[PDB]
Symmetry: C4
Subunit: 31 residues, 4 copies
Amino acid sequence: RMKXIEDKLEEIXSKXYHXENXLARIKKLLX
Amino acid sequence: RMKXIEDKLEEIXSKXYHXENXLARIKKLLX
Amino acid sequence: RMKXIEDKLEEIXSKXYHXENXLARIKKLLX
Amino acid sequence: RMKXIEDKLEEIXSKXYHXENXLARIKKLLX
């Protein structure tokens, strides 16, 4: 319940890596 | 409480699909 | 505790509006 | 449990700063 929430939060804290490195893809398409 | 949280987390884990496929829209505007 | 979490989740479900409409800013900079 | 969740939520509410200011990087690459 709480651990299997905190361990969705640590998927989101993956999505906010893959957010960053999407954007840094785009920024290095634009230098 | 916990399930109707985990089931917001599984909306966010939709938003982080629609994040990805927004960016992959942009990347394929830029190839 | 649970309500003042669910009501952070409904800030994030604002950020994922302002995600979308950031990107749709960018897409309509690119048409 | 609940506080060490709410205090992941306040990391995500950092990621959704660094989301915004990524995009505003990109927008000011595009003016």
